[PDB]
Amino acid sequence: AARK
Amino acid sequence: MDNQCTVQVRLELGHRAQLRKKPTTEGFTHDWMVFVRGPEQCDIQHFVEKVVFWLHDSFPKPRRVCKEPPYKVEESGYAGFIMPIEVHFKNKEEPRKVCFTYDLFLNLEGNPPVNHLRHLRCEKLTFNNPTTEFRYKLLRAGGVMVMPE
Numbered sequence: 001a002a003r004k
Numbered sequence: 005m006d007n008q009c010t011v012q013v014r015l016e017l018g019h020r021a022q023l024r025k026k027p028t029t030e031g032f033t034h035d036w037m038v039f040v041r042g043p044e045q046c047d048i049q050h051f052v053e054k055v056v057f058w059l060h061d062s063f064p065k066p067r068r069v070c071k072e073p074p075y076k077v078e079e080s081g082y083a084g085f086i087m088p089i090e091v092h093f094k095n096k097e098e099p100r101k102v103c104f105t106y107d108l109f110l111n112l113e114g115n116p117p118v119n120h121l122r123h124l125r126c127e128k129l130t131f132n133n134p135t136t137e138f139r140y141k142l143l144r145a146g147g148v149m150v151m152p153e
Contacts, residue, residue, distance in 0.1 A: 001083070001084060001109065001110045001111035001116070002082060002083035002084070002110070003083055003084050003085065003109075004060055004062065004083040004084070004085050
């Protein structure tokens, strides 16, 4: 999953 | 050691994430909720003045304040982030607040098996030599007194  | 006293209270922190059936027009893929709550049948409003959730700067008005229960933030996003969480206590002596760093993840590192995620973080808070009033606020919230530290 994407992380920011 | 005449008036030594240690009070321990428990807070539950957590979040729930769900993949959206359709991504939003901004491309948000997920709906999430982050919360701070008491353990079962424990009202933390006795000792909690406010909870502040610091959202990623992509979100509008990133400092989210809940001065009353439910202590939660609900939003849609496309990525997980580090969210600082401040729990402010109903006291006039230090510790005034405790700061947690919460990992709002939209999926667990290993696998993406299902569309729904739930995470729970129990945190036990320890207060040494609380004032009489804050101790009673703590005890009413389900807190207990333990061996003095």
